[PDB]
Swiss-Prot record:
Residues 43-89 are annotated as: Interaction with histone. The gene is CREBBP. Found in a complex containing NCOA2; NCOA3; IKKA; IKKB and IKBKG. Probably part of a complex with HIF1A and EP300. Interacts with GATA1; the interaction results in acetylation and enhancement of transcriptional activity of GATA1. Interacts with MAF and ZCCHC12. Interacts with DAXX; the interaction is dependent on CBP sumoylation and results in suppression of the transcriptional activity via recruitment of HDAC2 to DAXX. Interacts with phosphorylated CREB1. Interacts with CITED4 (C-terminal region). Interacts (via the TAZ-type 1 domain) with HIF1A. (Microbial infection) Interacts with HTLV-1 Tax, p30II and HBZ. It is linked to Chromosomal aberrations involving CREBBP may be a cause of acute myeloid leukemias. Translocation t(8;16)(p11;p13) with KAT6A; translocation t(11;16)(q23;p13.3) with KMT2A/MLL1; translocation t(10;16)(q22;p13) with KAT6B. KAT6A-CREBBP may induce leukemia by inhibiting RUNX1-mediated transcription. Residues 81-99 are annotated as: Interaction with ASF1A. Acetylates histones, giving a specific tag for transcriptional activation. Mediates acetylation of histone H3 at 'Lys-18' and 'Lys-27' (H3K18ac and H3K27ac, respectively). Also acetylates non-histone proteins, like DDX21, FBL, IRF2, MAFG, NCOA3, POLR1E/PAF53 and FOXO1. Binds specifically to phosphorylated CREB and enhances its transcriptional activity toward cAMP-responsive genes. Acts as a coactivator of ALX1. Acts as a circadian transcriptional coactivator which enhances the activity of the circadian transcriptional activators: NPAS2-BMAL1 and CLOCK-BMAL1 heterodimers. This is CREB-binding protein. It is found in: Cytoplasm; Nucleus. Changing residue 84 to A: Abolishes interaction with ASF1A. The KIX domain mediates binding to HIV-1 Tat. Changing residue 45 to A: Impairs binding to acetylated histones.
Length: 116
């Protein structure tokens, strides 16, 4: 089995996360964990059982919590799927999520080819 080192993953994958952060306005709702109290949405954690956001993914890369690139991809997709599940299709957050998914798809593919 291919063994990936933490810094190899950070060097390869952090730029793809940065590409998401660079999207403005689209990344703005994703830069910190959803706070249902601040946002007045007490149903949030009833619907979203496994929250995820850019800051959490960044911390996981920085602290070596991914063994394999697919685990990073899964967390990015968890973030997207949570947002598409919770938010209405007409909402800013939903449409912003869709743009981030486009950007991520584009950025991640050449990187995955390089890591194989
Ligand atoms: C720039 O875009 C916005 C600005 C304000 C709002 C309303 C408030 C809001 N509505 C938000 C909704 C979410 C959210 C996500 C993500 N998934 O479910 C929910 C609910 C997360 C954060 C949200 N936030 C916080 C926003 C983004 N601020 C963070 C600080 O800097 C920019 C302004 C929504 C948006 Cl999309």
């Amino acid at each position: 089995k291919k063994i990936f080192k933490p810094e190899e993953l950070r060097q390869a994958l952090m730029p793809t996360l940065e590409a998401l952060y660079r999207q403005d306005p689209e990344s703005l709702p994703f830069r910190q964990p959803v706070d249902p109290q601040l946002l007045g949405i007490p149903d949030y954690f009833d619907i979203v059982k496994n929250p995820m956001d850019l800051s959490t993914i960044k911390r996981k890369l920085d602290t070596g919590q991914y063994q394999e690139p697919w685990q990073y991809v899964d967390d990015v997709w968890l973030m997207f799927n949570n947002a598409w599940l919770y938010n209405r299709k007409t909402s800013r957050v939903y449409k912003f999520c869709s743009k981030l998914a486009e950007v991520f798809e584009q950025e991640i593919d050449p990187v995955m080819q390089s890591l194989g």
